[PDB]
Symmetry: D2
Subunit: 455 residues, 4 copies
């Protein structure tokens, strides 16, 4: 069952419906790298769900009431009250987006040489942990690393790995546990409430802090409501509030589940850390009462976080992604399983099994998808993994995928059909997909500006 | 086929359904007339495509650049030259919506006792004709009155009827021919270019003026491109411009095909009529330089009329209506055929064969649709047709219909499925729909605020 | 004493600061008629205070929450509740602006041959009265016709003239009393509460209806608060509510004192007339619940009417106009006295006493003002009076004036200084102002498109 | 002279004053630091010109056309090419505001132990220099530190000081010269083109890089046009482009002279530095294609930087500040002279000659201004100067000032008169202002959230 949109369209965004012949020329001008395409040339842009969301009429009304004062803006107090109400943390510091909050948390909470342990990781999060002297330890359950395994709550932390870390390194040498909801690297997999409570129980017995990476915590809450026994009578807001009751604080990218185009924040319960955070936020972001955001954006993020709590909104959000995954899977197209809250990942290793990884199957599949449909997707394979600059060899990741990342409230099921129909047609003659070779490769950030040609 | 939306969602508004018990209360508080229900108590609002459209990001950018000057506004010049370019008429007078332009035309072009002949009546149009002393004569082809007959270009004028009128009444006693594109009350049926050309040739030979009702001219142009031999490779804009080349002027409700929420205009080629129209507009609407519109709305209408010329936009507009009609017809639900440009008309005579037309089956069917579905639709039958101003008896249209009217760019195919599924279920117990009788009847245009009770 | 603006600027409107040499070319291209100037070529546009107001951030937030439903829009209920609260009338029908409401009132309230009596008149108001068969009778106090007489509440009705009318024509032959607040034709002069109560007392004794032309009723309320004994402790809202307690209904142009760019409405207390108005509004304007306005505009007008009740806003509005009049008067420039709520009128007969009225001194002064300052003003003299088309002679009005009409919240005191300094400099060599002659004169609406050259 | 605003008001926001008793309570709740007051409790907010500007109708139209794509946004391309055209640098990296660009520059261009030399310190700039291991050296002319000395181009670097630094330290130990235009903490003082050219010539001869702080470069260009011989007939844009031709790159807070509420960027000519900057921006800000900004804000900043080039806009901006300074100086109030581009600085040393600088007269004067006036102003003296990171003692600036900072396009001359009248009255009892002592001092950038009590 797939629900209708629980909203209607207030205003539309103009697009170029250029045809296949012209899309091929645009793809070649981009050197077959979807990251180099111009937005104006893309029909359906599934590069990312970050910051690409459609706002409501209520949020746009809030955008006309930005109090742009440098200190003490009414919009900050609205955001503060909303986050305290819905997440339940004592203190909040706005940041311009998620990695701004990560920067502050890692400087406040890590002594060099300490460990940070988490359920897999995200690139910016782990960078700020490592930059401040932490050693990262993955404590996710082993199943999360099996991309074909169709089981619930795949993002759960293995409590035995956490106990083992505590026993081998000592609780005083662990800076914090970093629990992400959902788990992006596993394909957007949720964490169960039972897991969050067990982690809080164990860490609290040792005086260890837990901070959440909360960027898709509402998608996570929907999975708990749908699949965890005992939560069928709880509202999304009740589930969200209980989730954060098991944490000492969080970092949040509003660009994901708060339904905005920019914005984030840092939450914590400890007064002393809050005071230290306010001393640091002015260094990198702005005042404790704007944190690198215009007043109107704090307002839109306060309104959007509250909208995200509507059951029908988040049900439809997750089930629209599920629709895309279900349609591909029914045609035999290989995807990461189960489908996550925000994206479908194509398995390009299996999709293009006639290509070796050195011929960049995911990069080439993403280029084919755009030519055939006008859909942009993100390479998440060997190109994004980068090259080892000491040895000169590619980093070879186990996952060679194309990410179909779904912005919130932007597309319809008919757009999902454009994406799926086009991929299914490609799959039916997948052996015709050609390998790629570099014609320009920069030393760093190579996925952003590299250019290719066909082998 | 059924194309996906050729645009993305930029902003949303929430929709919601109140329980059946509450809709029942609301419906009897509205005296079983859908016009009297409150917007907040509707779920999917298909009352009308008039003024309910979603604007684009470009139109909303135009809304921030309203030049609100009383005379000489940049927005007026933009609207004036956009209409001169796309429609080809010499002169434009803005009005706040279509019936303001009809008020002006009828006062300018009718001498009491004269005939106005058109391809089927419309409610406000016919009121202003008769109010100024004209007798209305219907010269549409007989087939347009047969709901079930699936033939192309049902809106066409019967040239034999036009010829007969000229012979029996004399050309000097005909004030003008009123040619509407599409024809709303026939079900949104298009008029062919061959018919517009034949009508021009016959009227010109007798010195008789032709004024178009331009309200859904872009939907009409799409049907010409899709189905009239020789037009398959003409652009929508080319077809629109050729259409109006066979007219002396037009009235336009921009609230339909100009993709806005308010706005209209009167066009003409004749200099003396334009001079007279400017004297009159001051009394009813405003100065000729804004015609009862804010500058920002002249701007949005100039932008939206040009957007409407995009083939993919109007193809999707029309085929989304066709999807709803196709799904209802596949389930056996009786509808007006072929499906028109803007709405699906349920054939209330067949839905409610247990009722005579004096029991108002269309009015009653609309009420029952809201009660069982939360979807609002409009009566288009004996209630809307009014009374004969000579005998005092009902006008008795063969077409007794309930209109599922689709606003432009607002809903998705999933919303269409919700509508179709609900109507198909009500079809299964159609015998439960009771007849209605008047408890309050306005003296004109009675359908707007009439109140009914069950017989 | 002149207060600072009780607001700050949220956003600005871009203007062309073209210099004098270029302004002279624009004036010549406009044939020396300020009505023909392009808005884009004007620095400070004082043509009118109608519909040219600046909205607040709160109103623009309301503009993002337009409920564009054809019937039952939430914005209509907001407007309805606001007008019932602030004006106290039982029923309200929205219209697209003031003359839409006048059209409806005059058709509902006049039997042919009846009299309508008022404190002077406005052009559209009297047209709709006369078009429906009324004979207009001026019952303003004699002093209002003395444009140099500096006395308070110059708009007051002479109760003896009203008694005389009742005695000579009979109360059953008077359709209604039309009491305007303020009185535009006298230069924007207020009416006292004592006068409103006396008129209500007298008319009620005879069963005669009173309807207000309420377009600048808030400016009027400020004069009562400032100058009528006993109202120093009353709020603007209290004064406004008491004013309308002496009326049976009103017509309102929101384009003036409701601080919007479009919109108006009709109010009445009588159920039967309300029911008749709802039958008529659909003919000319729209549904009783939108009346020719987009939902967003009903919202902005509801918000703006409530903002207009703020004492500091309306005090500053009236005193900014007063500042301009005081500065001109201190330099000896001849103006209509006292200065009204919305405009300063220059006496061009005295300003250009070396020119005869057939040389159009007001039209020429308005052209000079634009060339010297970039300020557009309105001719209100012999050109606007029109030509008698039977005899071919000008209508020769006693008042030959240039109107400096001040939009609400758009300009600063520094703009008022630009206007005043430029006029004062012109006055110091007023004998150099040249007379004008027609080079193009249309048969009607001649002030709108006539063109001139220097004698 | 004092020109009128070269724009009209398009939209407003209300302002209000709470009673003195309430401001007194608010001020001690803020611990006598103006940074801790709440926006709703301020009347006229002169805390800062940073991010408080009023945008234009064109910018707000741009805000409706935000292309929120993660890469390839039309808004990024517009900002990129606008900056390349107006500033002339080869490469641009957007950041969410200026201190994000300072974070990147300081990490890219400083090796620990090296010197950075600039024309007076700024708070966030100096923090990021020192945090990355640089020693700051002030090479502004001695006169810039003398509040009362009225000389032109007080921001100029002393070339003898620059030469001395090169001789004593060696050019290889200087990371770069930081040249700010205007110089904020000297009172908004401009730098001459002759000085920028001399600095470029001397640094280039030694291979030393020059990076500008571009934050108020348009105000600086205005002073050059107004006062530097030979530039009187150059356009603001020409002057701006020549200015940056003497630099290797710049940091920019668009929140000042780009007329926006959020936004900044880093420019450079060097290709390898640009490559490194793109790696770093990902960690702190976002992808190089949006740099921590929504698309709509890249758009507003591209539009606003071009608007700032309009001569009449920036002339009025600067002369409105000058008006406030002239009115205070005419009444004997001690100020920094000449008045700078963005603010009037009261000379707190002279206002409060009864206090030593260790009693924080500037911090105390700011509090008393809010208590007596409701006007918020900022401390710019010993509190902002921070502590010496080697000795732990106060930095002791000669300039102990209270800043009346003017947001662009927000206030009128009448608002300036309210401010001046209030300060002139407080001047009459200056002996009533008590000294302050710290009760809470942050470890860096302490002025933002420090809390004080009276001695
Ligand atoms: C309101 C509707 N139509 C308006 C209309 C009008 C009157 O336009 P305004 O509603 O803008 O006055 C004129 N001609 C045709 C063919 C129309 O359909 C409707 O069908 O719902
Ligand atoms: C916030 C202020 N200034 C910021 C600033 C900055 C830092 O910019 P952001 O506030 O955008 O980070 C850098 N350079 C100069 C000369 C500045 O004035 C202020 O003066 O109020
Ligand atoms: K974004
Ligand atoms: K701001
Ligand atoms: K207007
Ligand atoms: K509407």
């Amino acid at each position: 069952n797939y629900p209708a949109e629980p909203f209607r369209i207030k205003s539309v965004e103009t697009v170029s419906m250029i045809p296949r012949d012209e899309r091929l020329k645009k793809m070649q001008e981009a050197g077959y790298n979807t990251f180099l395409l111009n937005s104006k040339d893309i029909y359906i842009d599934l590069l990312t769900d970050s910051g690409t969301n459609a706002m409501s009429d209520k949020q746009w009304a809030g955008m006309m009431m930005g109090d742009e004062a440098y200190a003490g803006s009414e919009n900050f107090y609205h955001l503060e009250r909303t986050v305290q109400e819905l997440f339940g943390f004592k203190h909040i510091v706005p940041t311009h987006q998620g990695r701004g909050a990560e920067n502050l948390l890692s400087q406040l909470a890590i002594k060099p040489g300490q460990y940070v342990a988490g359920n897999m990781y995200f690139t910016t999060t782990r960078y700020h942990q490592e930059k401040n002297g932490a050693v990262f330890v993955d404590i996710v359950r082993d199943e999360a690393h099996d991309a074909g395994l169709n089981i619930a709550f795949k993002g759960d932390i293995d409590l035995k790995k956490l106990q083992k870390l505590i026993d081998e390194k000592g609780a005083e040498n662990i800076a914090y546990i970093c629990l992400a909801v959902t788990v992006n690297l596993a394909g957007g997999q949720p964490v169960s409430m039972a897991n969050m409570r067990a982690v809080r129980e164990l860490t609290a017995a040792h005086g260890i802090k837990v901070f959440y990476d909360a960027t898709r915590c509402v998608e996570n809450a929907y999975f708990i409501k749908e699949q965890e026994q005992g939560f069928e009578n709880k509202s999304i807001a009740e589930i969200v509030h209980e989730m954060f009751s098991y944490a000492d604080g969080c970092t949040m990218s509003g660009k994901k589940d708060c339904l905005v185009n920019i914005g984030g924040f840092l939450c914590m319960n400890d007064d002393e850390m809050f005071s230290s955070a306010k001393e640091l936020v002015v260094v990198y972001e702005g005042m404790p009462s704007y944190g690198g955001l215009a007043g109107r954006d704090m307002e839109a993020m306060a309104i959007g976080l509250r909208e995200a709590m509507q059951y029908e909104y988040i049900e439809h959000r997750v089930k629209q992604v599920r629709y895309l995954g279900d349609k591909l899977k029914a045609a035999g197209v290989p995807i990461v399983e189960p489908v996550g809250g925000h994206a479908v990942f194509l398995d390009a290793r299996r999709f293009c099994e006639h290509l070796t990884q050195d011929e960049f199957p995911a990069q080439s599949l993403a280029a084919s998808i755009y030519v055939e449909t006008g859909v942009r997707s993100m390479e998440r394979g060997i190109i994004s993994a980068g090259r080892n600059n000491v040895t000169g060899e590619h980093h070879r990741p186990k996952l060679e995928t194309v990410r179909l990342t779904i912005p919130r409230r932007v597309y319809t099921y008919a757009h999902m059909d454009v994406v799926a129909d086009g991929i299914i047609k490609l799959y039916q003659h997948k052996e015709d997909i050609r390998g790629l070779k570099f014609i320009y490769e920069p030393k760093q950030l190579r996925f952003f500006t590299a250019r290719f040609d066909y082998i």
